[PDB]
Design a protein around this ligand. Structure first.
Ligand code: SAM
Ligand code: ZN
Ligand code: ZN
Ligand code: ZN
Length: 215
């Protein structure tokens, strides 16, 4: 049962994952009703995986496209022992397709740094905790992170990692791929998003067409 230092946002070590956009001023309309949410299903920003800025957004406080910025994580997640896969994360309540679940947190390091760490600190680990970020940068959650680090791999996932431009910085959120009832274990496909460490592991996802191996 594995220990780490819990953080509320990424720790930037030797790099800065600048995106090179701004998420700038959509043509979404602020709905007249107080509790109807704006910037939803046709928001200019959303369509390029960029969050709105609270300074620019026409929808003001009803802007529902600032989910990573505002740390709008689901509150129903639970760490549990998952047969054959150490610890896992399940949801205690239903979640709907496309819904934002949590940001993936860790230390943001260059590929070179993460490689050094793999040799000098992690070379003996039996569990791996790292996401590709972009341009030869990685989110390393071996030492610091949040509960997203415990989310297991599936060859038939119910969630995915999406890279977003947030105030000009790339950050990664987990989103539901499909509806899931209460008690469902969260999973994503590591072969897409997880950093290739060169140490392969048997896959126990239990899918009919399981690829047999993670990485
Ligand atoms: C990001 S961690 C997930 C948390 C891990 N289960 C634990 O208890 O700390 C990834 C590690 O979990 C295990 N794991 C995740 N998914 C698996 C799977 N589908 N089959 C076998 N092992 C898995 C592997 O050891 C993998 O290196
Ligand atoms: Zn919008
Ligand atoms: Zn907006
Ligand atoms: Zn599998």
């Amino acid at each position: 049962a594995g220990s780490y230092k819990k953080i509320r946002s990424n720790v930037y070590v030797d790099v800065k994952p600048l995106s090179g956009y701004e998420a700038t001023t959509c043509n979404c309309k602020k709905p007249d009703d107080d509790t109807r949410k704006g910037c939803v299903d046709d928001c200019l920003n959303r369509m390029i995986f960029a969050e709105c800025s609270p300074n620019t957004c026409p929808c003001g406080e009803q802007c529902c496209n600032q989910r990573i910025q505002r740390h709008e994580w689901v509150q129903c997640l639970e760490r549990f022992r998952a047969e054959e896969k150490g610890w896992g994360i399940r949801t205690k309540e239903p979640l709907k397709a496309g819904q934002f679940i949590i940001e993936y947190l860790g230390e943001v390091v260059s590929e070179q740094e993460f490689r050094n760490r793999m040799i000098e600190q992690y070379h003996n680990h039996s569990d791996h905790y790292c996401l590709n970020l972009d341009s030869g940068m990685v989110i390393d959650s071996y030492r610091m992170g949040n509960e997203a680090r415990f989310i297991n791999h599936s060859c038939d996932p119910n969630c995915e990692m999406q890279k977003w431009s947030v105030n000009g910085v790339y950050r990664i959120g987990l989103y539901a791929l499909k509806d899931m009832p209460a008690g469902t274990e969260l999973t994503y496909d590591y072969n897409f998003h997880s950093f290739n460490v060169e140490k392969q592991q048997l896959c126990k996802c239990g899918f009919e067409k399981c690829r047999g191996i993670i990485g």
